[PDB]
Symmetry: D2
Subunit: 255 residues, 4 copies
Amino acid sequence: GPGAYISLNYHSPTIGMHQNLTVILPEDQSFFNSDTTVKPLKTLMLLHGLSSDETTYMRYTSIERYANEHKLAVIMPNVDHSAYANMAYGHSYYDYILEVYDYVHQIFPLSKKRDDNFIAGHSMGGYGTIKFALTQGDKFAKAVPLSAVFEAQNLMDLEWNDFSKEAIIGNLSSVKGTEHDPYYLLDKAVAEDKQIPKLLIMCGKQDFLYQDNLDFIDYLSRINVPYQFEDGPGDHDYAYWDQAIKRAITWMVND
Amino acid sequence: GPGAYISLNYHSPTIGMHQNLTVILPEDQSFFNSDTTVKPLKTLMLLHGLSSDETTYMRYTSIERYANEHKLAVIMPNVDHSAYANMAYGHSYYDYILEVYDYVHQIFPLSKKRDDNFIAGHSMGGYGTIKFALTQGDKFAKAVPLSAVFEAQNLMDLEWNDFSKEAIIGNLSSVKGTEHDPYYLLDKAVAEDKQIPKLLIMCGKQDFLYQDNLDFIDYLSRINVPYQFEDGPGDHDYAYWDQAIKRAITWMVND
Amino acid sequence: GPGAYISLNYHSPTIGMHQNLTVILPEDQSFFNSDTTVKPLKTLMLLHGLSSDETTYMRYTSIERYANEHKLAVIMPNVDHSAYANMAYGHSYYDYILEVYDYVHQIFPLSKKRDDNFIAGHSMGGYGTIKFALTQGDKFAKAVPLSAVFEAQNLMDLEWNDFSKEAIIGNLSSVKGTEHDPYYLLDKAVAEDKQIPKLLIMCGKQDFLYQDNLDFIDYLSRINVPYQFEDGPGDHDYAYWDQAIKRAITWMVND
Amino acid sequence: GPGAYISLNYHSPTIGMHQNLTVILPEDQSFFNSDTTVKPLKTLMLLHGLSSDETTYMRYTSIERYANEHKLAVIMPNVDHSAYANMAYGHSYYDYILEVYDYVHQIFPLSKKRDDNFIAGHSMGGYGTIKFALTQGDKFAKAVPLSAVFEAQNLMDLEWNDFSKEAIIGNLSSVKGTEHDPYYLLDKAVAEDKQIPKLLIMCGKQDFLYQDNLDFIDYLSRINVPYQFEDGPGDHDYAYWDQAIKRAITWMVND
Ligand code: NA
Ligand code: NA
Ligand code: NA
Ligand code: NA
């Protein structure tokens, strides 16, 4: 039912600047009793898409209502137009997500057990989610890409307002086969027998990335990596992501 | 040194409503390194005066700059026009301060040792400070009333905009000898051998409460309770409280 | 179409303290061109229920998403446990809503035309909505009480956490025939031919206030005051108010 | 004097993302009476330095206290590590400042007369201030660079945490004689007789940029452009900028 909505602005050693972060911290009885041990909460790292920021899930969905119902802490960082990369000409935004993870688990009552930690996000943030799932599989038991970009070239080549592809990839001529390519990261994770979080992939059938989502899950099936895929009516918008994140939160906290 | 500025809004079980709270949390390297143990911070509970709220210290002083310099966490709650009382007709705002104290020490990396915990505030908040110092002396090693109301009639009889004295005290003819009277609370602390935090009492010489402050320290001297009193040029305003809280923070963290 | 989410804290002359307010301001191209006259937006005054505040509609609904779709500015004030009254022992919160109305229409590009201004709210805020609709009908063309208290005793006699009925009504043993009684305000508006905003009344069938809603619309029918009533599955919670305020916004903005 | 502190987050068409902005809006009578035309305020565009953001002036200075004393609205945008440039690989942050100027003058009661509009900022923001002063002289009657970078090479060649010079200037081997060079902007302003805002230049004597400031004012003297230069004890920190912005605000409004 009740929780805390928290806005934090701290000077990040990784990206060299003050940066805003938002946190949903559902209430627990132990948080109000100085005689009892704090019960650490299950925790979701939740990644915004391109043009969104740390405020937009709160504004355009009812995520705090869903999170409070399931006692799930939610961490919402801001990564600008970075695509969750350590940018060639810009900020170290991949490392920044690792810093945020460590920081909030140190200063808040969040469980540090892998089974209690999840990651999710939409569009550019679903791309970010799969990138972290395949390279930081020891940190998250479950990962939920929503309406994700899996073929990196479609996001690097998109002509969105003020977006600079070169800020991210620099001198790279293509992203295929680089750290920016989720298919390469997947091949590397399997080849090196890394832990892959349990995967729930969701995408609206009217989304322009729907075919891209179908291509990725087919490849997952061909390399014997399990996943759950949920589709249905929905487009590339927060009307879909509001309903999708509600369904995702129920899925992540039940197992 | 850098820190986090934190804005929290949570549903309070004590006062039955969502309520904002602000927190300054200076940064420590242990907060970013998952391999080391988090070092708990010294903590100040800082109480606003009448017409102010949880935002006004940040807005009208440079308090976060001072706190960051001394690695001091600062907790700034909102108690409206309550005078930090469990109100006759209103909210349980005395109890709320205790709830805020417990909550932030549970969810944040704040030291729970009495020697690491301080309380301070100006005007109505200096009245609140002395009330908590004399009734919750086990929670604070030091207390700093700034420009405080010590003779409770001086606060209750004020004709400030929209302020209701009866909301606080109900039908009481006088507050002398009641839980609203710092002189009664002081006599009772002495009589019951309660621990009294170290007192630093500050007031500007042009403050209309200056004589009220001199009367209180005169009484403290007459009952052999130690204190440090600092005055000088200054009035009943945030220009004075900015400089006073700066000098107070240095005093509380040294020794 | 996106917009601005605004958090404002100003010292109120009416309530004698700093208070927080939240505003949703959808974007118009006139806002970005210094050569054109700003186009004023339709504006909704949205009132929270008991235990909520200025943040809770944003946190527990997708109201900003709905408002942006319909280019509707939304004003969300905080009135604590006041029931939108000028309190017997407390603050002038009825007058405060009038001050907020004037203030935001002055400092923001909001239409001052009656036909462009609406008011809505749930539970205690639906009680507030009907009180303002029946006493300030010249300020609002439409009013939408959601899950409202219409029989004031149902609100006052509530044993809600930390709630003080006497702070609001003083020593009164009944509220019938007073400014706290919507039925009296309705009788007085009908008798004096006041402008009554066009009325849309919504309540969930599982809400404990559902019968109170049926009683009020039954009275409206007996006295030939027009209204639209919409019910259906739903309880006394933000899951219902999220859906209801989306439906209400669509109703206000068109015809 | 009391005012509003405003935090806004809107989706910017220029930079293609949600972005936070803070505004100080001192109160005026007309703001509380909707029957009158609102009175427009004098307005200052205040630009942060490297590693700061839209929150840091509020947090580390008492700027709102100073602004309220002089009924000066203050606009504090966020421009990250951009150096206020339209970045070679990044965002169009020069255009963004112009968008913010137009946006806040449309939606808030801000005077559009050149004589009522000022710009100021420290370090990277002092560099930004002089760039806008020399290229947008029709928008600002006065400009106040604080501890500014005037020799652009010292900012671009800085080795600050996560800072990318290439993101700003691309492969350029020097910035001399370019739009990133204040001396070139100065020569072109003088050559084309464009109006130069009245200049107040301040820097602390212990600042590592002090000589850079001395070089710039010497050049202004040699090309017969007036200025007032104020130095004194002070370093490259917010202890200095707090006192400097207080002195600057008194100068701007008094004219
Ligand atoms: Na995206
Ligand atoms: Na006071
Ligand atoms: Na209610
Ligand atoms: Na700088």
